């Protein structure tokens, strides 16, 4: 399937963090979250270790057990939306995301608010023999993108 970048990926805390979006999706269980028919996009956080990660993840590996919320702003209109992502798995692997209703075509800012795996119940080893570095503190990452909508076969008859 096709996916579209929302702004520029960034590196922070030995991870590469990107925002992306695609068409609304269906997830298990049915009836939970915003239904696809009532959404404009599935918004996602793509987060993987980079080389030199000190928390036990190899380059390219997904970072699991994160807690992530977002603040989305249409910069043209001022309209703001807040929400949370869930951990998910799709055909191209695990991610964090949510179906969302957008706030019209325009220039957007999105900020992801990220908390480390300790919060959701992952426990790092801390000893000399098997341990890893301490978790980083919660942080934000921001993205700027132009949203025009997604591809159609035709919105009106031809």
Residues that bind its own copies (CB under 8 A): 1-2, 22-23, 25-30, 32-33, 36, 42, 55-58, 61-62, 64-65, 86-94, 117-118, 121-127, 129-132
Counting Cα atoms < 13 Å in the Cβ hemisphere of 71 gives 8
Distance of alpha carbon 9 from alpha carbon 4, whole angstroms: 12
Applying CB under 5 A, does 22 fall inside the site for Cu ion? Answer: no
Please choose which of Cu ion, its own copies, none residue 137 contacts, taking the beta carbon within 5 to 8 angstroms, the exact cut-off set by kind: none
Omega of the bond prior to 29 within 30 degrees of 0, cis? yes
Structure tokens at 84: 């949370």
Please choose which of Cu ion, its own copies, none residue 132 contacts, taking the beta carbon within 5 to 8 angstroms, the exact cut-off set by kind: its own copies
Residue 152: CB minimum distance to Cu ion, A? 21
Distance of alpha carbon 39 from alpha carbon 2, whole angstroms: 17
Site size with Cu ion, rule: CB under 5 A: 2
Cβ pair 142, 120 in contact under 8 A: no
Residue 28: CB minimum distance to its own copies, A? 5
Please choose which of its own copies, Cu ion, none residue 50 contacts, taking the beta carbon within 5 to 8 angstroms, the exact cut-off set by kind: none
Distance of alpha carbon 98 from alpha carbon 48, whole angstroms: 18
Structure tokens at 95: 């991610």
The position carrying tokens 């098997």 is 130
Distance of alpha carbon 137 from alpha carbon 59, whole angstroms: 20
Please choose which of its own copies, Cu ion, none residue 51 contacts, taking the beta carbon within 5 to 8 angstroms, the exact cut-off set by kind: none
Site track for Cu ion across 91-120, x = CB under 5 A: ------x-----------------------
Site for Cu ion in 45-64 (CB under 5 A): none
Residues that bind Cu ion (CB under 5 A): 88, 97
């Amino acid at each position: 399937f096709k996916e579209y970048p929302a702004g520029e990926p960034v590196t922070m805390n030995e991870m590469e963090l990107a925002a992306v979006y695609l068409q609304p999706i269906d997830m298990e269980p049915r009836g939970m979250g915003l239904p696809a028919a009532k959404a404009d996009v599935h918004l996602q956080a793509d987060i993987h270790a980079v080389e030199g990660n000190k928390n036990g993840f190899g380059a390219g590996e997904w970072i699991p057990y994160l807690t992530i919320s977002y603040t989305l702003v249409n910069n043209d209109t001022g309209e703001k939306q807040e929400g949370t992502f869930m951990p998910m798995v799709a055909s191209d692997g695990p991610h964090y995301g949510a179906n969302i209703k957008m706030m019209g075509v325009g220039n957007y800012k999105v900020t992801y608010h990220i908390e480390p795996p300790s919060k959701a119940g992952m426990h790092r080893h801390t000893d000399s023999e098997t341990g890893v570095g301490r978790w980083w503190k919660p942080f934000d990452v921001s993205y700027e993108f132009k949203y025009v909508g997604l591809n159609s076969s035709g919105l009106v008859p031809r």
